[PDB]
Design a protein around this nucleic acid. Sequence first.
DNA 1: CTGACCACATTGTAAGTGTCAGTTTTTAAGAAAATGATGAGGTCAG
DNA 2: CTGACCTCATCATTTTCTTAAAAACTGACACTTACAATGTGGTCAG
Lengths: 364, 458
Amino acid sequence: KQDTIRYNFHPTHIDTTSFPFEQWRKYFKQTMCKENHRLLLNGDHQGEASFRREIAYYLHHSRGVNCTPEQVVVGAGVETLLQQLFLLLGESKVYGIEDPGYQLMRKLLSHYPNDYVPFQVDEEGIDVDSIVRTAVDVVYTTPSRHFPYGSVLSINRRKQLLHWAEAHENRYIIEDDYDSEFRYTGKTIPSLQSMDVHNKVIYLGAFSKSLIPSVRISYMVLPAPLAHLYKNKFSYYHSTVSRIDQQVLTAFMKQGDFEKHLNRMRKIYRRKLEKVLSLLKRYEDKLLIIGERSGLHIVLVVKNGMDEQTLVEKALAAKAKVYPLSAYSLERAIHPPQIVLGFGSIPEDELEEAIATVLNAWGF
Amino acid sequence: ELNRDLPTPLYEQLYAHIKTEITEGRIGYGTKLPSKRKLADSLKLSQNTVEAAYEQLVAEGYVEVIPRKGFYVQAYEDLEYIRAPQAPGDALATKQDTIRYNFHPTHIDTTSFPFEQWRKYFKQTMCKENHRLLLNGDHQGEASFRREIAYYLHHSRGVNCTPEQVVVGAGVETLLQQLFLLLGESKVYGIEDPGYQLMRKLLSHYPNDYVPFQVDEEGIDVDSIVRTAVDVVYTTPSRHFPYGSVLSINRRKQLLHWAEAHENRYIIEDDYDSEFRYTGKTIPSLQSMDVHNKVIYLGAFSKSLIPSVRISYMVLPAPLAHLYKNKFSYYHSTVSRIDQQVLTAFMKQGDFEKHLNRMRKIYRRKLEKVLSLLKRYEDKLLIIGERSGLHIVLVVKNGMDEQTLVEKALAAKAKVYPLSAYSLERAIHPPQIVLGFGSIPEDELEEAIATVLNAWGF
DNA sequence: CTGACCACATTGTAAGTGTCAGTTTTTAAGAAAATGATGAGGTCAG
DNA sequence: CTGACCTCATCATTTTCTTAAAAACTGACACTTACAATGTGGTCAG
């Protein structure tokens, strides 16, 4: 991504002034001491055993995942967590991507021999019959929340996809959490793995939109057949999460000091959501709003007569960074140029003027 | 039906009792779900309790709303199948648990690292006005970090490279796969054998091919590579694992000309261990001689500074770096921005040089002490390449094969490292055993050597 | 009897301990604000 | 014409939240000492 002049909007951003520096510093200055000389040398390759038992307990008590600790595996970034899966499965597969989606599996297949099968996505979710008619083997879905429109899978389509997977032994399912645990009224839904008693789906979650983008931890769980294969085939690599950054989070989330950050962050964001919605409700004549209320971003559609190209350059001409939707979807978009905006990285006390200047830039 | 006074509120109970009626089939599809006002009186609860018992189910999709009519069920009979697949695994791992006396050649001394300077440097970085450092910036490392590395190597190792080329990454393996994908799958790679078990095993996945070679006291079979059709080669110039062999300079002109002969050839130079020669500084870096952009530099901060910070660097020549930037504009780095902005100051104020000096002197002292205790028994034990390195190679001339010797180390709770693992060909009739000491401090060398030597009956 | 060889003594820093003065963690208390549950209402079609 | 979906408050309770005091910390200094390089001074070999 890019640096900003004045203000920018980005879904992957976050508002960071609210993060407790000091409750991190205390754990750090506890963790690496003179008595602790063994941590300097290289540890295990899947993360330290405590950092996995604790993730097991956390996910069981927050998302319904019933995973015995030794399955889960750590990784760094997100994409570097994926490759090891690609070469693990093989190169005789074709992966199912939502055509509007998070443009990741597109760029991680441009460098491997496989190719991808696009799909259309409706206001309820992804298709479930288009996969059935085609012979795709792996699909990359967002059961908890659909980037960037916000649709949520019902029970019917989820049960159809799971029964589809159970049809034969040659296909696998990717779950991508994105921005869950931020669902306000409830906790969204018992996560998709919970419904499975067939050990046929993998879990993929992150620590980089809820805690910190730049500390670079992620984690997946593997079912009984795939975890053993991965371990037995990949013992000779080395873990990529620093062993000093495992014990800090083991304390930071072992004594109950992560939930007290999540609960605070929910509010931190809800008020901003309501303030921006209140500011926009005056402007309902033209700048329509699409999307169920959750997460960190909204998609505004502009029914003015201006085009996406001159719109974006006019926005950036007066030191305002706008983010057009042309890139996120493979096909050409509709006549009203959809625009995705995120509010996370903007300062709270400047929404009221930043949004106003943005709306001023194009037309009053 | 009593769910008051529970720590569990009434929302996720009534919303949980509708689940039974819809999923278990007591309420059919399309049936009229009673509206709230009839229900609110029915259960004695107010509307705002049962309201959110339902307003959740619209998102989960168990029911659907009609704007002026009651909520209606839209949830088919679920296809519940009960079959529990389970698969066992071999789960290979070659490392033993917490037991005394580890002699692994990778370990670096742990107790002597300046914890306190580390913490002091850390405290000044992650602070209140230092936000903008929890989100991601540039993907190719801190700009200050690149400039600092470029100035460090240019005056400490003879490297001539500008920062714009330099690359930072995570370890070595993840620093190598971005190179395999960068070059292609039509190449064949030249390795050393016996040697380091990384590039041989790491290519058990990719289509590419590898050519085993052999190592003399001069170095690698440069003429053999000349009389072959390999394209990009892996060598360890300034020191050679694990014999301490050093590449002769004339062979270095030969290898430079070998690479220069054909345009598509490139040379991997991996000087993992540097500035750790006990005497006379160390040989200058190979790429200082090359003038026409045919060599890439690979090195890391992971035996010098700390084993577990997982950081490395890598230099690219201008045509290859340009192409790497064009084709990799979307990846993001794997080194925490905080670690980068900490180490930039940590080496901006010169403390790393002091650490180098202290550990260098510590390790020399350990090696002369070990040699002076090692030297008295020489009827059966001999050493190669003593002058430099963090490890020794110990040949055992007892009249019996090496497997029992290796296992007897773990019989008495000692960790030993036979060279058979690093060696493809088995031409070792007198066993070669390599020993490391770097993790064990000075005061324990005596007892460790005594017990391990007694283990073999000495 | 001189250039060579062999020969210790001066020297300029890293390594150890005490003071102090400054920001600096740890702990108990009073106070604020949000949550779930009750209750009184709100508008609007067919 | 019932019936339907829906906007305000004040509650009991608790899990966040700003405050003031006393104890642990760590910085620039005082030096003082060890460590190990270099210049030096003794005789040696035709």
